[PDB]
Design a protein around this ligand. Structure first.
Ligand SMILES: CCCCCCCCCCCCCCCC(=O)OC[C@H](COP(=O)(O)O)OC(=O)CCCCCCCCCCCCCCC
Ligand SMILES: CCCCCCCCCCCCCCCC(=O)OC[C@H](COP(=O)(O)O)OC(=O)CCCCCCCCCCCCCCC
Ligand SMILES: C[C@H]1O[C@@H](n2cnc3c(N)ncnc32)[C@H](O)[C@@H]1O
Ligand code: MET
Ligand code: SF4
Ligand code: SF4
Ligand code: SF4
Ligand SMILES: [Fe+3]
Length: 498
């Protein structure tokens, strides 16, 4: 019948206490069982496919941190953060610049617009949160403004400039895009130096928007995309909240729409719905979907152009950072998140519009093996040796006709020389297709969250993993630093200015 895979620690979904949990294989799926001393037994889906679950375990990578912000007191996941036992530095920081929003979505992990209180850090508070992120070893390389809807603050372009001034290589905006339907507003974001728009995007028909968002936003999303084309803003990531029964049938359609718009869309990052914050009862009961379920949908709905073997877990590229760090004697941000948190592939869009994953014609598995081997052999000769082996890893038969294989190889080598511009050019050639499954109290796994690489900087000088922030800390923090809406409105204007 069942057989145990792992022991771990989880949370009771009722009282949020830390409780023991078992991860088990059962009928081809991975389940998590747990017991609360007070509220009894719980059973949830952890991963939809036991075979892919075991396959991803081989890419486990344990990171290290040196700069901490909190002490051990109550043990994980209560000591965030970062406490001395966290195993990853910040790769992408989140700063919530507001809890106000110009929407009222039925699915909202932040439960925006319900507290009756306004959380809006000052420009100086945000600079200090950025300093804390930049004090890490290595410094946090990427930051995203979130909330809430960040575009409802009139000072957002100044915050984007500030992030650039503070040294972040990548400045991202998570947004519902509504204000970006005005092209002059989009122009000010580009001019301020925004790297990427992380655009909420739930489908290619009206129904997923009606369900998840409460109204048909599809024409507005389309306008935002057309505005990006008009102003030459070419770095949009579409972000579907993936809900079984709502838009699991539109996975291929979203991917095809991105590929049709690959001049401005650099990726789709699917987010299987996370039962934190605000969720409607049908979503809670019927909507659960996991990373391997998503991978299966991609294969089915792109007619086998993208297959299961094309996806890798995020830490599979941790050794690339390690190697680059050793080659250059400079500490590099390392993607050391848990192997069951997320997955990605990369595809080329050819002339006919067919999707050709880079893994179809580059032996990515073999490439990562050589990388891990050369780390063990660490020097002046490594790069040349790897450059010698790269042709044996390529299948020129399966490569797209519209792709210069020699240029891709050179860009890969330049990434190994710590050329960030080559990594960015590589992303411009391709369409990233990824899926990240943020935890909730039903599937919480302490062994995952200890490796989390996506962190909120808070106004009380903490740095808190995304998955503990949205299950345990968001209300506490927002309540401390909010003022009642009644008084906030009388002291400000709608953009947040005094
Ligand atoms: C975790 C998942 C989510 C993370 C959020 C990421 C959001 C943007 C992050 C940008 C900043 C991070 C960049 C960084 O590492 O920072 C860039 C650094 C160089 O930076 P500096 O030299 O300027 O300090 O690059 C390296 O250290 C080299 C390794 C880069 C990271 C892995 C690269 C492989 C990824 C896949 C490439 C395409 C496929 C190739 C197949 C062979
Ligand atoms: C509200 C909070 C929500 C937080 C959600 C987390 C989102 C995580 C980020 C998603 C990814 C966005 C990346 C930006 C893409 C882009 O525009 O890319 C284009 C940009 C170039 O833009 P600029 O030149 O303008 O700065 O380059 C980058 O952003 C470089 C960083 C790339 C990060 C690589 C991540 C690796 C993932 C693991 C790969 C596994 C192996 C795959 C094998 C085939
Ligand atoms: C930052 C992104 O997260 C999406 N989002 C909002 N609520 C949820 C949820 N419960 N689970 C997953 N993604 C969600 C938003 O729609 C936005 O695109
Ligand atoms: C909780 S979502 C925060 C970012 C923005 N409001 C969006 O929906 O894209
Ligand atoms: S998630 Fe990390 S920072 Fe938070 S308590 Fe656990 S180990 Fe510490
Ligand atoms: S999901 Fe984003 S846009 Fe929707 S209500 Fe929440 S914060 Fe606002
Ligand atoms: S944000 Fe959640 S899903 Fe992503 S790395 Fe952190 S723990 Fe894993
Ligand atoms: Fe309980």
């Amino acid at each position: 019948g069942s057989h145990m895979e792992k022991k771990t620690l989880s949370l009771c979904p009722i009282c949020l206490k830390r409780i023991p949990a078992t991860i088990l294989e059962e009928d081809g799926k991975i389940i998590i069982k747990k017991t609360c001393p007070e509220h009894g037994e719980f059973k949830d889906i952890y991963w939809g496919d036991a075979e892919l679950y075991k396959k991803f375990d081989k890419y486990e990578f344990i990171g290290k941190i040196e700069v901490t912000n909190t002490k051990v007191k109550n043990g994980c996941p209560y000591d965030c953060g970062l406490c001395p036992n966290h195993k990853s530095t910040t790769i992408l920081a989140n700063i919530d610049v507001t809890n106000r929003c110009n929407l009222n979505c039925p699915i909202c992990f932040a439960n925006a617009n319900k507290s009756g209180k306004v959380y809006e850090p000052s420009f100086e508070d945000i600079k200090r949160m950025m300093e804390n992120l930049r004090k890490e070893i290595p410094p946090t390389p990427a930051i995203q403004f979130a909330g809430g809807e960040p575009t409802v603050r009139s000072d957002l372009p100044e915050l984007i400039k500030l992030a650039r001034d503070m040294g972040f290589l990548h400045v991202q905006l998570a947004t519902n895009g509504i204000k970006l339907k005005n092209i002059n507003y989009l122009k000010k974001l580009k001019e301020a130096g925004l790297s990427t728009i992380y655009l909420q995007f739930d489908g290619i028909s009206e129904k997923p928007y009606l369900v998840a968002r409460g109204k048909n936003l599809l024409p507005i999303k389309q306008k935002v995309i057309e505005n990006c084309k008009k102003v030459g803003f070419d770095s949009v990531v579409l972000v579907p909240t993936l809900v079984r029964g709502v838009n699991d049938n539109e996975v291929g359609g979203i991917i095809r729409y991105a590929a049709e718009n690959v001049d401005v869309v650099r990726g789709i990052n699917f987010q299987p719905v996370s039962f934190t914050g605000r969720v409607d009862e049908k979503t809670l009961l019927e909507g659960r979907i996991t990373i391997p379920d998503f991978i299966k949908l991609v294969e089915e709905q792109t007619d086998g152009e993208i297959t299961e073997e094309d996806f890798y877990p995020v830490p599979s590229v941790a050794p690339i950072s390690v190697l680059v760090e050793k080659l250059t004697n400079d500490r590099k941000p390392t993607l050391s998140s848990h192997q069951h948190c997320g997955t990605s592939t990369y595809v080329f869009v050819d002339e006919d519009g067919k999707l050709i994953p880079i893994t179809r014609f580059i032996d990515v598995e073999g490439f990562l093996e050589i990388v891990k081997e050369k780390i063990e052999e660490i020097d002046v000769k490594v790069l040349g040796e790897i450059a010698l082996k790269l042709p044996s890893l390529i299948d020129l038969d399966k490569a797209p006709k519209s792709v210069n294989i020699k240029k891709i190889i050179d860009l890969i080598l330049s990434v190994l020389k710590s050329d960030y511009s080559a990594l960015a050019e590589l992303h411009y050639h391709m369409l990233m297709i990824s899926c990240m499954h943020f935890m909730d109290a039903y599937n919480f796994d302490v062994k995952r969250v200890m490796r989390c690489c996506i962190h909120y900087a808070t106004p009380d000088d903490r740095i808190i993993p995304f998955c503990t922030y949205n299950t345990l800390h968001r209300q506490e923090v927002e309540e401390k630093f909010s003022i009642p809406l009644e008084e906030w409105k009388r002291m400000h204007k709608i953009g947040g200015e005094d």
